[PDB]
Design an enzyme around this catalytic site. Structure first.
Site, PDB file in Angstrom:
ATOM      1  CE  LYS A 109      18.229  39.219 -16.568  1.00  0.00           C
ATOM      2  NZ  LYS A 109      19.987  38.842 -16.596  1.00  0.00           N
ATOM      3  CE  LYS A 128      26.626  34.760 -16.859  1.00  0.00           C
ATOM      4  NZ  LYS A 128      27.339  36.282 -16.941  1.00  0.00           N
ATOM      5  CG  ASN A 136      10.743  50.289  -8.016  1.00  0.00           C
ATOM      6  OD1 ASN A 136      10.919  49.918  -6.936  1.00  0.00           O
ATOM      7  ND2 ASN A 136      10.142  49.464  -8.814  1.00  0.00           N
ATOM      8  N   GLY A 137      14.074  53.732  -7.587  1.00  0.00           N
ATOM      9  CA  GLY A 137      14.654  54.803  -8.169  1.00  0.00           C
ATOM     10  C   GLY A 137      15.580  55.508  -7.064  1.00  0.00           C
ATOM     11  CG  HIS A 156      54.189  40.763 -20.484  1.00  0.00           C
ATOM     12  ND1 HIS A 156      55.491  40.959 -20.848  1.00  0.00           N
ATOM     13  CD2 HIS A 156      53.646  40.531 -21.521  1.00  0.00           C
ATOM     14  CE1 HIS A 156      55.923  41.013 -22.124  1.00  0.00           C
ATOM     15  NE2 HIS A 156      54.436  40.554 -22.528  1.00  0.00           N
ATOM     16  CB  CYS A 214      14.018  48.510  -6.888  1.00  0.00           C
ATOM     17  SG  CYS A 214      15.190  48.962  -5.800  1.00  0.00           S
ATOM     18  CD  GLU A 217      26.340  37.644 -11.810  1.00  0.00           C
ATOM     19  OE1 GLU A 217      26.562  37.019 -12.957  1.00  0.00           O
ATOM     20  OE2 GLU A 217      25.427  38.722 -11.667  1.00  0.00           O
ATOM     21  CD1 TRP A 267      20.565  45.390  -4.401  1.00  0.00           C
ATOM     22  CD2 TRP A 267      20.188  45.635  -6.687  1.00  0.00           C
ATOM     23  NE1 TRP A 267      21.752  44.985  -5.022  1.00  0.00           N
ATOM     24  CE2 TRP A 267      21.447  45.195  -6.355  1.00  0.00           C
ATOM     25  CE3 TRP A 267      19.620  45.573  -7.993  1.00  0.00           C
ATOM     26  CZ2 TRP A 267      22.426  45.299  -7.438  1.00  0.00           C
ATOM     27  CZ3 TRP A 267      20.591  45.457  -8.900  1.00  0.00           C
ATOM     28  CH2 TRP A 267      22.052  45.290  -8.740  1.00  0.00           C
ATOM     29  CD  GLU A 311      30.023  35.983 -19.355  1.00  0.00           C
ATOM     30  OE1 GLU A 311      28.899  35.621 -18.808  1.00  0.00           O
ATOM     31  OE2 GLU A 311      30.188  37.222 -19.179  1.00  0.00           O
ATOM     32  NE  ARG A 345      15.270  44.631 -12.535  1.00  0.00           N
ATOM     33  CZ  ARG A 345      14.591  45.731 -13.422  1.00  0.00           C
ATOM     34  NH1 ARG A 345      13.402  45.453 -13.903  1.00  0.00           N
ATOM     35  NH2 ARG A 345      15.242  46.861 -13.073  1.00  0.00           N
TER      36      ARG A 345
HETATM   37  O1  LIG Z   1      26.331  37.917 -15.157  1.00  0.00           O
HETATM   38  C1  LIG Z   1      26.338  39.030 -15.290  1.00  0.00           C
HETATM   39  C2  LIG Z   1      25.209  39.907 -15.462  1.00  0.00           C
HETATM   40  O2  LIG Z   1      24.592  39.291 -16.828  1.00  0.00           O
HETATM   41  C3  LIG Z   1      25.489  41.586 -15.592  1.00  0.00           C
HETATM   42  O3  LIG Z   1      27.094  41.552 -16.234  1.00  0.00           O
HETATM   43  C4  LIG Z   1      24.813  42.232 -16.773  1.00  0.00           C
HETATM   44  O4  LIG Z   1      24.968  42.040 -17.934  1.00  0.00           O
HETATM   45  C5  LIG Z   1      24.881  43.862 -16.435  1.00  0.00           C
HETATM   46  O5  LIG Z   1      25.245  44.121 -14.820  1.00  0.00           O
HETATM   47  C6  LIG Z   1      23.905  44.620 -16.782  1.00  0.00           C
HETATM   48  O6  LIG Z   1      23.792  44.515 -18.181  1.00  0.00           O
HETATM   49  P1  LIG Z   1      22.336  44.532 -19.231  1.00  0.00           P
HETATM   50  O7  LIG Z   1      22.193  46.023 -19.405  1.00  0.00           O
HETATM   51  O8  LIG Z   1      22.548  44.005 -20.404  1.00  0.00           O
HETATM   52  O9  LIG Z   1      21.415  44.213 -18.378  1.00  0.00           O
HETATM   53  O1  LIG Z   2      56.262  44.227 -13.635  1.00  0.00           O
HETATM   54  C1  LIG Z   2      55.849  43.769 -14.452  1.00  0.00           C
HETATM   55  C2  LIG Z   2      56.646  43.788 -15.772  1.00  0.00           C
HETATM   56  O2  LIG Z   2      57.365  44.938 -15.835  1.00  0.00           O
HETATM   57  C3  LIG Z   2      55.725  43.611 -16.720  1.00  0.00           C
HETATM   58  O3  LIG Z   2      54.614  44.393 -16.731  1.00  0.00           O
HETATM   59  C4  LIG Z   2      56.051  43.480 -18.401  1.00  0.00           C
HETATM   60  O4  LIG Z   2      57.274  42.730 -18.706  1.00  0.00           O
HETATM   61  C5  LIG Z   2      56.848  44.960 -18.635  1.00  0.00           C
HETATM   62  O5  LIG Z   2      55.784  45.920 -18.029  1.00  0.00           O
HETATM   63  C6  LIG Z   2      56.654  45.332 -20.276  1.00  0.00           C
HETATM   64  O6  LIG Z   2      58.007  45.091 -20.771  1.00  0.00           O
HETATM   65  P1  LIG Z   2      58.850  46.603 -21.084  1.00  0.00           P
HETATM   66  O7  LIG Z   2      58.485  47.465 -20.231  1.00  0.00           O
HETATM   67  O8  LIG Z   2      60.329  46.468 -21.118  1.00  0.00           O
HETATM   68  O9  LIG Z   2      58.116  46.695 -22.547  1.00  0.00           O
END
Ligand SMILES: O=C[C@H](O)[C@@H](O)[C@H](O)[C@H](O)COP(=O)(O)O
Ligand SMILES: O=C[C@H](O)[C@@H](O)[C@H](O)[C@H](O)COP(=O)(O)O
Ligand SMILES: CC(=O)N[C@H]1[C@@H](OP(=O)(O)OP(=O)(O)OC[C@H]2O[C@@H](n3ccc(=O)[nH]c3=O)[C@H](O)[C@@H]2O)O[C@H](CO)[C@@H](O)[C@@H]1O
Ligand SMILES: CC(=O)N[C@H]1[C@@H](OP(=O)(O)OP(=O)(O)OC[C@H]2O[C@@H](n3ccc(=O)[nH]c3=O)[C@H](O)[C@@H]2O)O[C@H](CO)[C@@H](O)[C@@H]1O
Ligand SMILES: [Mg+2]
Ligand SMILES: [Mg+2]
Lengths: 652, 652
Positions: free
Chosen positions: B647, B529, B122-123, B548, B1, B532, B95, B525, B32
């Site tokens: 942004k 990116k 804006n808002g 796991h 906006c 996005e 926006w 990060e 914006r």
């Molecule tokens: O690439 C992603 C953008 O950079 C986004 O993640 C942004 O960082 C936030 O949406 C607002 O953060 P700010 O307050 O720093 O602008």
């Molecule tokens: O379903 C996924 C698995 O369960 C995975 O998330 C992980 O291996 C356990 O959750 C942690 O192992 P323990 O629970 O035995 O610590």
């Protein structure tokens, strides 16, 4: 991977009965896709025993235990009718690692072509290279590609160099483990020590079951260093069961001894003693486990059983711990520590995978009811950063198995720094359960499935019960506690209500059958829900499901939304309801057509959305349990539609 | 906006010069918001401009500003040759987070079919529903579903019920804002008040630019409850209402930054504020692409320079000194605190994840990193001895700003890490640091991330400047900072090698980016990116969590990017790489140049230069910035204007 040995001392058994006992034990330890298994026993068909003790016979095979059992009875030379008053048999099932599945590479491993020493092993010998070279220089030829064979060859090396003709089996093993590096659980058998067993562990679980119709000498085995041992009092008859998991013992006996790192347990003349190189002792305790708990029953898979039995496991988690008349919560494991915990200044929850999600799922209510800062850490990252820990921290370690490496190392890290450590575990005798100062056994029953289902929900309930204890002295919170506890009272029936919508989940599995991605969006109490659901669908369905914090959509991830991207949104009637409505409008504004998991009475959203799962309403800090179950089921049904075996692991 | 209005008082501008000025101002604000746009100017085709101020023309269209610039032109009714000596034109890009970006929902809104009052907002008005009902009862018909229409329909209600025949435009607007809740930045235009503009704000930015070849009466307008800013001797003056400084710098560098509840008004070409005139520290070049095709590409390749600007006058490498002037009067008190909390959204949150470890190392304090939206949902416990950091490039993010005010209410020491002087977060924090990265125009943050990264490192270097044991570590890091700009150039020189990799991935649906330790933030990060601006399903996975569950999603067809750097986690990351390979994965590896081990065993590698472990994240993320850029170009997308968002999220 799976260890089992059966020692009958003056309990007459036929060779058939012995082999049947070994095979049956391996079936308890066998999981989907174990490639090699074998058994070791006294060969020779001389009438009556004692003369057949100097002939160790091995029957190993590549495949499942079923094939082994067939091979056992496919032996023309063997006579299954000989009776042994005293005998020791050992058995092993494995998923081949150091090598390729082949009868030779299976266990037990032997020390020579005459089988003077055999061993079964769980773990890895890191320095097995140096040991193998040494033994070959001393004149020992190898025949397998396993690190285990070095153990069998080394014990014979110590025997061939003993100082006296009567050096104990224990001493020989003690000299072996001193040369080993890494993790191991071991059981030894030798012709030079007929009827005797030696078991030792380092970083790998190993326990001993005992049964005898006669009184036993003690229930607390004292340690012997380099009255004093367990044995039937007035008679000799006794049976011993070595195993790497209680599942292979509970059908024969519920009295077990959990060994600890560097313990050397030996059975000599039918009497069990535990030696150490370094009063303390090892306790004979009663396991509440039952054979029925490790069976599929009428369910076609363990994943299905453990999802649909969650009404029961939740009740098992709360039994003896909650009273809905006077609204009191009593976790026995925290009686001798609850007051000290309340004097600490911070809670740190440390876990991996789904166990970590259980902490995310209860972080808010812990902050609310304890009023302390609550940190939730992924164990691997917790270690990488050398996180600052202090003496007035209380550190929780959530682990179904109680053996996860990073969680266990985190436990030892926090103990080094003087923090109070608490375990939230599901395995009695496990490393994390033993080494924590105190804790809670969530009492969910054995979890045999590949993925965590009831363990997540029993951990959830266990942490809530702990939070309810921490505020039992706050007048201002008495009503909030009643609301939560009446929610726990009704929780089992609400779960049954969700499970009754299984037909609706299958209809959703059909919609996503051909899809390759799905975004699961939630916030607040349901941040953990969308993370746990995304993990289940990744682990079980093998599709790219991702959990997205709803409040982060407009910071980038919302760009994925279009008419083709499948989306599941979790919208419940709590304080974040309007915010979740906001996210929904953001998704729909970008051609998103999401599926919504909402409360049964959310009439506002049910008429606006394509497909909606309508779960019953409960207290806000318990809804996560009801809202994750449809995602558990969704992963199950999707995998089944695609021909996958939900009990067959893929990570491996 | 974005808001932009052009008022030329006694400065003749033809209707083509004003419209070209309104569109040119929106282009400066398009980043914006770019879902719809509109303009509001005087209609009629009378040679005498005085007989035209009674007719308002609205031209609103869906799409970016280019869709509006073409709608304004090729109109058969609007003669673009009428000379206006006094005219007011308002514009606004939207926006559309909710509903459709239709012209009816775009601004400026209107009060009636004749356009007696048009407003750009804006808002959000948090009570537009109660205002819509009241106005509907008095006989006002609504057309749009926006909350801005309730502001246009209300200023007419105060005009249709005025006490005197000549109630100032300020009086009408003053009665309106008293009935409006929430945040807003408004610019009104009415036929009854020809040429008169009114600009008020409350929780939303709004400045007024001024250009005049004649001397100005004052340099500090007095607030009201020898008074107005106007040219001396003559009337020629040009005003520039705008919600940002980029739309005004092109015409003048003399603006008036209003404050909450300040009702500015331009009457007869005299600006008065009801209820400073400083110079802008910005150059036009800073908001120009230069030789680059997009703002994001510029802002990526200018990171060698923006990093140097972040350290300018703060880091002395001759004596290894770090001094952040903003924290001079507070660094001593910060050290007496007991915990650090970093609160931010999106990429700014990743900046905290990327520096958490080193902050823990050099301060020895607990460091908690919180997503702002979740921080608020949980009512996170905060205390008086907490130091709360708020990372915000724009300094206006709603959730981050709410977290600030939350922590302030609990008596915490608040510190700002911002890139916009005079922003909400910069003002309301007790102290902080201006990262001095320069204006960021691309929606995706690139230089802001690395500049925040460096800024938090400089803070950590201050917190340990009195520790003997840490002197060598500080020198190591500072030498790294000295060499960092040239190493960034070394990474940028691999742009072509990155572009080749992009041609091998642009067709894929998903990509897994894996990392741990210092490079957990890097894979988070980079995943954000690629989400996005390329709309690929990219997800960051903590390497330690692969075993796991998530590892089951890897096969020979799933693209994988791994980050393996020469720090203490090298051996663990080599284990992860082995796991990925065992699952048939064919990963691309971002590693160190000297890492000959990884380079030999991997066909596809991006070799970045070595640096200090706690700075490597700056070099490892840049390839992923470039990769996201090239992938978007291959897929045919605009890197500067990604879909479904814009942004700065200044409205929750
Ligand atoms: O690439 C992603 C953008 O950079 C986004 O993640 C942004 O960082 C936030 O949406 C607002 O953060 P700010 O307050 O720093 O602008
Ligand atoms: O379903 C996924 C698995 O369960 C995975 O998330 C992980 O291996 C356990 O959750 C942690 O192992 P323990 O629970 O035995 O610590
Ligand atoms: C293992 C055991 O025999 N538990 C018994 C205990 O249950 P009870 O519920 O009282 O206690 P728990 O089973 O939860 O834990 C047993 C002991 O192990 C400790 N512990 C547990 C988990 C952990 O992760 N770390 C840890 O240190 C506990 O602090 C406690 O001292 O009394 C009940 C009778 O009322 C019995 O039904 C249970 O069989
Ligand atoms: C705005 C300004 O004129 N800064 C000057 C200041 O920079 P200097 O680096 O010394 O301080 P900053 O520009 O970073 O911040 C200016 C003031 O705003 C406060 N603040 C900043 C960011 C935030 O998020 N929250 C907050 O409260 C700071 O505490 C500080 O009191 O001295 C330098 C000379 O050495 C000059 O080059 C800079 O022009
Ligand atoms: Mg214990
Ligand atoms: Mg300030």
């Amino acid at each position: 991977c799976g260890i089992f040995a059966y020692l009958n001392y003056h309990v007459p058994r036929t060779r058939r009965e012995i082999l049947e006992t070994l095979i049956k034990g391996l079936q308890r330890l066998e999981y989907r896709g174990y490639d090699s298994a074998g058994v070791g026993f006294d060969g020779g068909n001389d009438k009556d025993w004692e003369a057949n003790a100097c002939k160790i016979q091995l029957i190993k095979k590549k495949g499942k235990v079923k094939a082994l059992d067939e091979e056992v009875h496919k032996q023309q030379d063997m006579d299954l009718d000989i009776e042994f008053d005293v005998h020791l048999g050992i058995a092993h099932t494995r998923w081949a690692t150091h090598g390729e599945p082949s009868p030779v590479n299976s266990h037990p491993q032997r020390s020579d072509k005459n089988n003077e020493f055999i061993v079964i092993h769980n773990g890895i010998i890191t320095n097995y290279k140096d040991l193998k070279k040494f033994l070959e220089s001393k004149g020992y030829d190898f025949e397998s590609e396993t690190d285990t064979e070095t153990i069998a060859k080394l014990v014979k090396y110590m025997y061939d160099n003993r100082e006296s003709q009567d050096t104990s089996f224990t001493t020989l093993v003690e000299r072996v483990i001193q040369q080993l590096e890494g993790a191991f659980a071991l059981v030894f058998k030798s012709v030079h020590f007929p009827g005797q067993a030696v078991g030792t562990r380092r970083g790998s679980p190993l326990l001993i079951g005992v049964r005898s119709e006669h009184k036993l000498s003690t229930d607390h085995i004292p340690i012997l260093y380099r009255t004093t041992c367990l044995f039937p009092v007035e008679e000799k008859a006794v049976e011993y069961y070595f195993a790497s998991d209680a599942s292979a013992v509970i059908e024969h006996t519920n009295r077990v001894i959990f060994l600890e790192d560097d313990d050397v347990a030996a059975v000599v003349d039918g009497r069990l003693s535990i030696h150490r190189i370094k009063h303390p002792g090892r306790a004979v305790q009663t396991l509440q486990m039952e054979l029925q708990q490790i069976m599929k029953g009428n369910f076609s898979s363990f994943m299905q059983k453990e999802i649909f039995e969650q009404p029961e496991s939740v009740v098992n988690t709360m039994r003896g711990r909650v009273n809905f008349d006077d609204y009191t919560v009593n976790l026995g494991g925290l009686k001798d520590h609850i007051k000290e915990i309340q004097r600490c200044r911070r809670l740190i929850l440390i876990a991996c995978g789904t166990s970590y999600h259980a902490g995310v799922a209860t972080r808010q209510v812990l902050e609310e009811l304890t009023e302390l800062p609550v940190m939730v850490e992924l164990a691997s990252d917790f270690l990488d950063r050398n996180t600052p820990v202090f003496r007035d921290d209380v550190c929780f370690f959530l682990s179904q198995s109680g053996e996860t490496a990073d969680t266990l190392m985190g436990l030892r890290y926090c103990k080094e720094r003087g923090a109070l450590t608490v375990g939230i575990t599901n395995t009695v005798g496990s490393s994390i359960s033993r080494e924590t100062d105190c804790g809670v056994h969530i009492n969910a029953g054995p979890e045999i499935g590949v993925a965590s289902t009831k363990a997540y929900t029993s951990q959830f309930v266990s942490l809530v019960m702990f939070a309810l204890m921490m505020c039992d002295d706050r007048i201002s919170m008495q009503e909030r506690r009643k609301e939560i506890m009446l929610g726990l009272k009704r929780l089992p029936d609400l779960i049954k209500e969700v499970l009754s919508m299984d037909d609706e989940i299958q209809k959703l599995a059909t919609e996503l059958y051909h899809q390759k991605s799905v975004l699961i969006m939630g916030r607040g109490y349901h941040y953990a829900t969308c993370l746990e659901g995304a993990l289940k669908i990744k682990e079980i369905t093998y599709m790219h499901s991702e959990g997205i914090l709803a409040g982060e959509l407009k910071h980038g991830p919302l760009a994925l939304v279009d008419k083709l991207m499948p989306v599941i949104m979790i919208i419940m009637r709590d304080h974040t309801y309007a915010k979740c409505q906001n996210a929904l409008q953001q998704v729909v504004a970008r051609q998103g057509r999401p599926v919504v998991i909402c409360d049964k009475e959310d009439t506002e959203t049910i008429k606006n959305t394509k497909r909606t799962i309508k779960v019953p309403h409960s207290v806000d800090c318990l809804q996560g349990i009801l809202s994750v179950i449809p995602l558990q089921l969704l992963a199950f049904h999707l995998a089944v539609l695609r021909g996958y075996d939900v009990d067959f692991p893929r990570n491996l």
